[PDB]
Design a binder for this molecule. Structure first.
Ligand SMILES: Nc1nc2c(ncn2[C@@H]2O[C@H](COP(=O)(O)OP(=O)(O)CP(=O)(O)O)[C@@H](O)[C@H]2O)c(=O)[nH]1
Length: 638
């Protein structure tokens, strides 16, 4: 046989997981008919279990006295989207979900979209919760607009309430639809109709191509029609290669470890095996057996075979996620398409109490590994490395898991704006003469000149030209950037310059490293006149939102510390691409989605300091060291 890589998406609470566990029982019965739960083996991760929902993409694989296959169970809601995308970035076809009230959810839309551009050969809906107020007319109306998929055929309905019965039919309509696809069919349709078998092939070819697609309906709760559905889903949906017998080609699948008893690993074969050594980036694989996934639980395997498909319950270190198993066939599988899951919003993560720091450091490593997008990045202002999560939703769960394994507890907000304090206005002071230091005359002088916006100016020479004060202007740049940021208000040198000369030496006095100390001192005095330029935070924060919400979106933007620029309506939607200060990203992002329900989207940086418009109430954070320079400064102030 073969199988077929299929995932399961859709909004929250719409049966995604249960429907999954279902396909397991339906296509099996090797000792189970429904298996209690409530909770089971599919979602074995604590919390995921004790919690209720699956915050991590599952990974199932059922089979029958005919064939088998795997699966990937994504999580609903947001925040976790970044772990849902990773699953989708493998899987060819997506079993879209849709519960009763789930009348065209927010994710029911998107899943289907990605797949349409990726190549997903077929995407399949499954209305769940046909309990009450479960029309049939409503399902199709929603479908046709959203999924915008090609007008398929029917049917799948009959009876009402307790009298509800499974049905479908609609041959003529199907013929008509298929007609669009083939000229030959139309002619026959106009005069004849042909057969069904061949028409079934036309549809099946179109589904693997990423064009045609059919949807089956069959309730869910009472899980009746469940068992036919499972048969029918597996039917048209497998692979190729296999047939022959040779070469193993695969794509190391994710599946990170845990705390309790280390972890495992899984890869998919599409015409390969499992054993021997290995290859790829000079490195030995090391194996002690082949692989062979299994329904219930997954255990080692003696042997497998070519064109074999399953999961390997192993793999650990000396490797990593997304790993290409060299080779021959893996490079081609990389011609499907990506989705730069773009993680937009983010927050500040801070270690915590001393006791909590030991665990923190280890935590930050483990949370990063169990994530393919856990960009662990460290800031300069603090020795703490902020977390990179498409949202806190991930970060809640991330402190919950940790609270067990390693054990820790930190905070989750965003951070600081460096301050910059690169105002404009203008000022100039200098140059010393000698004192608590020891002239050491070195006159000095800095002609501060605000400027316009977007030039980072800087400078400058001065001078005399004779090595001296050369590397000295070096010391310059130094102390420069130095307070440039760290300082009174802790800014980041940006928009200013300087220049001077002198003087005295050829014996002693100490006119070397001392200059570096002096430089800062001079800048400080100019502070009183500086002000403490916030800077200018905005970018363009540019909001992509629907034509209907954008008016009210624009009234809310001025209240929300944002500016607006015009917004042209592009089709059914709009873009309302504007500027503003900088964030709060969170503030910016919340409101948009809020009065939009769930049908917002946005991103974009921009850069630029020109701003400062933020008053004060703060402006601080440093500083530095270096006896000399430091001793000198303190005296100077006196
Ligand atoms: N009435 C009804 N309720 C159902 C049906 N299927 C599932 N549910 C309800 O939903 C609960 C859990 O749903 P689940 O499958 O985990 O939802 P989900 O799609 O995984 C949502 P997420 O993955 O985002 O956590 C069940 O315990 C049950 O009460 C159904 O067909 N009809």
């Amino acid at each position: 046989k073969i199988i077929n890589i299929g995932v399961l998406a859709h909004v929250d609470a719409g049966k995604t997981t249960l429907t999954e566990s279902l396909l397991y029982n339906s296509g099996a019965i090797t000792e189970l008919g429904s298996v209690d739960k409530g909770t089971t083996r599919t979602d074995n991760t604590l919390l995921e279990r004790q919690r209720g929902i699956t915050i991590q993409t599952g990974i199932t694989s059922f089979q029958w006295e005919n064939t088998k296959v795997n699966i990937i169970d994504t999580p609903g809601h947001m925040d976790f989207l970044a772990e849902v995308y990773r699953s989708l970035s493998v899987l060819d076809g997506a079993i879209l979900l849709i519960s009763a009230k789930d009348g065209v959810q927010a994710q029911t839309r998107i899943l289907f979209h990605a797949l349409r551009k990726m190549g997903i050969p077929t995407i399949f809906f499954i209305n769940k919760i046909d309990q009450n107020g479960i029309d049939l007319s409503t399902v199709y109306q929603d479908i046709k607009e959203k999924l915008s998929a090609e007008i398929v055929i029917k049917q799948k309905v009959e009876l009402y309430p307790n009298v509800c019965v499974t049905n479908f039919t609609e041959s003529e309509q199907w013929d008509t639809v298929i007609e669009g696809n083939d000229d030959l069919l139309e002619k026959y349709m106009s005069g004849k109709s042909l057969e069904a078998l061949e028409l079934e092939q036309e549809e099946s070819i179109r589904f693997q191509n990423c064009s045609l697609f059919p949807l089956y309906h069959g309730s869910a709760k009472s899980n009746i029609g469940i068992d036919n559905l499972i048969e029918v889903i597996t039917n048209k949906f497998y692979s190729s290669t296999h047939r022959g017998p040779s070469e193993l080609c695969g794509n190391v699948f994710k599946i990170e470890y845990t705390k309790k008893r280390q972890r495992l690993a899984y890869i998919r074969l599409y015409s390969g095996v499992l054993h021997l050594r290995d290859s790829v980036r000079v490195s030995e694989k090391e194996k002690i057996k082949v692989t062979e996934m299994y329904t219930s639980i997954n255990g080692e395997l003696c042997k497998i075979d070519r064109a074999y498909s399953g999961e390997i319950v192993i793999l650990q270190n000396e490797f990593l996620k997304l790993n290409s198993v060299l080779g021959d066939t893996k490079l081609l599988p990389q011609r499907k398409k990506i989705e730069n899951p773009h993680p937009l919003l983010q927050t500040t993560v801070e270690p915590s109490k001393p006791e909590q720091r030991e665990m923190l450091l280890d935590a930050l490593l483990e949370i990063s590994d169990s994530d393919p997008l856990l960009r662990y990045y460290v800031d300069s202002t603090t020795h703490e490395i902020i977390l990179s999560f498409l949202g806190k939703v991930q970060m809640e769960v991330i402190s919950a898991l940790l609270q067990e394994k390693y054990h820790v507890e930190i905070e989750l907000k965003e951070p600081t704006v460096i301050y910059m304090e690169r105002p404009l206005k203008n000022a100039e002071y200098t140059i010393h003469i000698e004192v608590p230091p020891n002239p050491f005359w070195a006159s000095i002088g800095l002609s501060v000149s605000p400027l316009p916006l977007g030039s980072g100016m800087q400078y400058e020479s001065s001078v005399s030209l004779g090595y001296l004060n050369q590397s000295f202007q070096n010391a310059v740049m130094e102390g420069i950037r130095y307070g440039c940021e760290q300082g009174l208000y802790g800014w980041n040198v940006t928009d200013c310059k300087i220049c001077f000369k002198y003087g005295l030496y050829y014996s002693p006095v100490s006119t070397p490293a001392d200059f570096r100390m002096l430089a800062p001192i001079v800048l400080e005095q100019v502070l009183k006149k500086a002000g403490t330029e916030l800077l200018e935070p905005y970018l363009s924060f540019k909001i992509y939102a629907p034509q209907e919400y954008l008016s009210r979106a624009y009234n809310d933007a001025p209240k929300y510390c944002a500016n607006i620029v015009d917004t042209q309506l592009k089709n059914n939607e709009v873009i309302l691409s504007g500027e503003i200060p900088a964030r709060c990203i969170q503030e910016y992002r919340s409101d948009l989605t809020f009065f939009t329900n769930g049908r917002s989207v946005c991103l974009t940086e921009l850069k630029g300091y020109h701003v400062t418009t933020g008053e004060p109430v703060c402006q601080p954070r440093r500083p530095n060291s270096r006896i000399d320079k430091v001793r000198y400064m303190f005296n100077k102030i006196t």
